[PDB]
Amino acid sequence: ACVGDGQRCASWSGPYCCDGYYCSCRSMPYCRCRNNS
């Protein structure tokens, strides 16, 4: 199972994203997971 769009990555960076999405980590611990571009 993968995370949807805009879904933050577990804790700080545990699970991955769907086939095509990524996980950003701006000024904050809770990284965000969403589509590529």
From Swiss-Prot:
This is Delta-amaurobitoxin-Pl1b. The record marks 8, 12, 22, 24, 26, 28, 30, 32, 34 as: Pharmacophore. Insecticidal toxin. Binds to site 4 of insect voltage-gated sodium channel (Nav) and inhibits channel inactivation. In vivo, it lethal to lepidopteran larvae. Has no adverse affects when intracerebroventricularly injected in mice at a dose of 0.2 ug, but causes reversible paralysis of legs when injected intracerebroventricularly in mice at a dose of 2.0 ug. Changing residue 7 to A: No change in binding affinity and in lethal dose. Keywords: Amidation, Disulfide bond, Ion channel impairing toxin, Knottin, Neurotoxin, Secreted, Toxin, Voltage-gated sodium channel impairing toxin. Belongs to the neurotoxin 07 (Beta/delta-agtx) family. 02 (aga-3) subfamily. The modification Serine amide is found at residue 37. The presence of a 'disulfide through disulfide knot' structurally defines this protein as a knottin. GO terms for biological process: envenomation resulting in negative regulation of voltage-gated sodium channel activity in another organism. Changing residue 36 to A: No change in binding affinity and in lethal dose. The keyword Secreted applies. It is found in: Secreted. Changing residue 30 to F: 16-fold decrease in binding affinity and no change in lethal dose. GO terms for molecular function: sodium channel inhibitor activity; toxin activity. It comes from Pireneitega luctuosa (Tangled nest spider). Disulfide bonds join 2-18, 9-23, 17-33, 25-31.
